[PDB]
């Protein structure tokens, strides 16, 4: 059997049950290709209510998080049995904000070596439970996960599936990450690797299966500039060890972008993309393509965007962002068609050629306003709008300029 | 020696001369086909110095014209010497605004028969000068037409040219008419024909040649237009029922139907007029028929039939810039269409079972939509869509972009006029 099959058989067969109820916190089930050996589907829902419920501990590593450690721990101090904060010798409060308001949370210490894995890996060895789940301090643990976490541990042990576990992280942007690898069995197998952009690897160097489970965490400045300068130092390091690695070329390339060094980021993204072709962990391959495409787009480099676009479209055909960059290009072509039309109208007006409608060629000025407003070309519309030579056209334009003046401050009203 | 060549031997040479000054008040000159008997050039400039300067009477027919008759007669009184004013028994004052300030302008009377040419007769009779000039109550004789009139009458009497004379008459819309036919020699050769849309004709009903001269005459309107039209159409329909296949009248009746908001029917007459001008001799208003049918076809969003009448407009009057106006409007409508079809092709897209790697919220798609419908001025949907974006920084920039164009509108709106 495949876990996929087991879930189906449990749908019409045993949707009554608890094994079912708790197996539906697993999003990711049709991805699990390993045989789960079973000899009776009936004995299984029955043996699941007899199953042990495991212990989860919650590891947080903090530096100067005076601003956000309170809301963080509040989200989380009721959902675990043991919470371990790992102070890297904060210069501000943090430590004592924790000590009075949160009496039950262990506080430990560790000087910062420039290694998120070493820190993270301390809390692993300090931790007493039999699963761990990591959460960072600017993050917040949805009210919705109440009583759900250990249910996820329980099923995965009940089938004894080896995996790390990703909840959904929702960016403050609303962007929703699902390769987060934040929870895993505390059983000697599996330890963080990497000075930065670290993730749990099962220690034969690995790459464990990832259950996306149905748990959620939410956000809680222009200190992005701060954090990024910190990480690029670490990323460039990790990359100099493996200078041809597509993941590291992309990671570095990305942070270069974040430090607006876009021309240099495009080079690393172009190299990352060449190297993913024949390379096994293709997880961030898409992230390189859609970033190189936006940067190429932002530099009005349509030929190279089209080339990379065809790659994104053949390598990931069900990615909607292909349709995004194609739209963006048509809309560019339309701008030029508008401009070219604005330009033959000017060429027309400057002949000897007479008008039978309005000898003042003043109806042409209706189209040219219309057409340069559309092009956002207020420079040239303000102009054209003086060259008008008649009251009742002027009378016509100002009354139409107002009804859109007031349609704007109507939509501008009800956003913020 | 033709006339346009006499003007080349003055412009090149005899160029400070009094003949050349008065002859540059004639615009229409290379059109004058008749040849002229000269001695030399010299003989001809000096004969002009010893020539004359004829007299011009100014004719005005009027009905209830209380509001404009004062401004009118001002423009004219210091410029003609004799001006007759034919009242048609106007029920309001009018006649006595003329009494007061304009004592030397000889108010004659006449009962109104529905015949504009006939009213123009009765002023040709009473007139005593050599040339006549006509003007209407809603026009103002331009300030800068100072003593230019009789220089026109001189040059035309000197070469003893037969013709009618057209000043430029300015619409309330700023448009300049130059087939106006307002001045002619009072030598029993020229006279108005036609109950309405009268013009001066030779006595064999032929068509006097039209010098366009360099005189400006302006305007003074709101909704007297609907009542003037409703009167004129009564006459026009009569004249039409006489030659019911005459394109000039098919056009005139269609035009007035239009001015009375009977557009659906105005097009039917414009179409027949355009069909009949093909052959027909006097094609003066052929162009006016086409461009009015085109502008109405545009208003009704009938682009298929617009294109077809635009072709005819283009083959017949290729140098009319109004061709390009209509081709432009079409091209631009096709743009709008491509845009809205993209708006929808984008919409279909961000529903499918299809994910984004850039932003799960697809909020970047929604920004492209917002930007289409701002361009499409579909402010309706700019509102819906901007409610469903969850990234506060984009919602901030939509706020700041709208403010940009809000400010720039309120800026261009200021310095119009
Ligand atoms: O010297 C430090 C710096 C940070 N932290 C804490 O550890 C986490 C690091 O997160 P952060 O300061 O937010 O850096 P980011 O770049 O925003 O975090 C991303 O990048 C890190 C570096 O790989 C990852 O560990 C995180 O999972 C990932 O959210 C946070 O809880 C910090 O408070 C420390 O304990 N010591
Ligand atoms: O029973 C009338 C009605 C009007 N008028 C006067 O005649 C002139 C006609 O001008 P208007 O009343 O403004 O009519 P429109 O339709 O605006 O004028 C156009 O249409 C008329 C009919 O063809 C022409 O006389 C004009 O030259 C032409 O400008 C004006 O001075 C009127 O005051 C009369 O004499 N008798």
UniProtKB/Swiss-Prot annotation, chain A:
Protein name: SPbeta prophage-derived glycosyltransferase SunS
Gene3D superfamilies, A to Z: Spore Coat Polysaccharide Biosynthesis Protein SpsA, Chain A, Tetratricopeptide repeat domain
Domain of life according to the entry: Bacteria
InterPro entries: Glyco_trans_2-like, Nucleotide-diphossugar_trans, S_glycosyl_SunS, TPR-like_helical_dom_sf
Gene: sunS
Keywords attached to this entry: Glycosyltransferase, Transferase
Molecular function in Gene Ontology: glycosyltransferase activity; UDP-glycosyltransferase activity
Assigned EC number: 2.4.1.-
Enzyme class: transferase
Primary role: Transfers a hexose moiety onto 'Cys-41' of bacteriocin sublancin-168 (SunA). Accepts UDP-glucose (UDP-Glc), UDP-N-acetylglucosamine (UDP-GlcNAc), UDP-galactose (UDP-Gal), UDP-xylose (UDP-Xyl) and GDP-mannose as substrate.
Similarity section: Belongs to the glycosyltransferase 2 family.
Single GO BP term: protein S-linked glycosylation via cysteine
PANTHER family according to UniProt: GLYCOSYLTRANSFERASE (PTHR43630:SF2), POLY-BETA-1,6-N-ACETYL-D-GLUCOSAMINE SYNTHASE (PTHR43630)
Organism from which the protein derives: Bacillus subtilis (strain 168)
SUPFAM superfamilies recorded: Nucleotide-diphospho-sugar transferases, TPR-like
């Amino acid at each position: 059997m495949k876990l996929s099959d087991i879930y189906l058989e449990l749908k019409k067969g045993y949707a009554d049950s608890l094994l079912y109820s708790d197996l539906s916190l697993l999003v990711n089930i049709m991805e699990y290709e390993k045989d789960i050996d079973v000899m009776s589907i009936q004995s299984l829902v029955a043996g699941y209510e007899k199953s042990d419920t495991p212990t989860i501990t919650c590891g947080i590593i903090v530096y100067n998080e005076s601003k956000r450690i309170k809301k963080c721990l509040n989200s989380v101090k009721d959902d675990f049995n043991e919470i371990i904060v790992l102070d890297s010798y904060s210069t501000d409060d943090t430590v004592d904000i924790i000590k009075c308001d949160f009496p039950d949370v262990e506080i430990k210490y560790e000087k910062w070596k420039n290694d998120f894995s070493y820190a993270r890996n301390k809390i692993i060895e300090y931790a007493t439970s039999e699963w761990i789940y990591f959460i960072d301090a600017d993050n917040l643990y949805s009210k919705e996960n109440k009583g759900k976490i250990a249910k996820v541990a329980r099923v995965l042990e009940f089938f004894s599936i080896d995996c790390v576990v990703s909840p959904y992280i929702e960016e403050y942007t609303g962007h929703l990450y699902s390769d987060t690898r934040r929870m895993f069995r505390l059983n000697g197998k599996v330890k963080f690797h990497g000075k930065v952009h670290e993730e749990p690897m099962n220690y034969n160097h690995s790459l464990p299966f990832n259950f996306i489970v149905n748990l959620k965490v939410y956000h809680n400045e222009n200190n992005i500039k701060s954090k990024t300068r910190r990480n690029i130092n670490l990323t460039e390091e990790m990359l100099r060890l493996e200078p041809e690695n597509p993941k590291w070329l992309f990671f570095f390339g990305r942070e270069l972008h974040l430090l607006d060094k876009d021309e240099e980021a495009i080079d690393y993204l172009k190299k990352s993309i060449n190297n993913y072709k024949k390379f096994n962990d293709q997880r961030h391959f898409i992230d390189a393509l859609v970033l190189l495409c936006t940067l190429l787009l932002q530099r009005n480099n349509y030929v190279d965007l089209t080339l990379y676009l065809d790659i994104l479209e053949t390598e990931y055909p069900r990615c909607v962002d292909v349709d995004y960059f194609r739209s963006a290009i048509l809309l560019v072509d339309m701008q030029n068609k508008l401009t070219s039309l604005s330009n033959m109208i000017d060429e027309a007006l400057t002949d000897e050629r007479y008008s039978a409608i309005n000898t003042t060629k003043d109806h042409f000025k209706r189209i040219l306003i219309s057409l340069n407003i559309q092009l956002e070309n207020w420079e040239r519309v303000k102009e054209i709008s003086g060259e008008i030579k008649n009251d009742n056209m002027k009378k016509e334009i100002k009354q139409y300029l107002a009804n859109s003046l007031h349609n704007i401050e109507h939509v501008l009203k009800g956003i913020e």
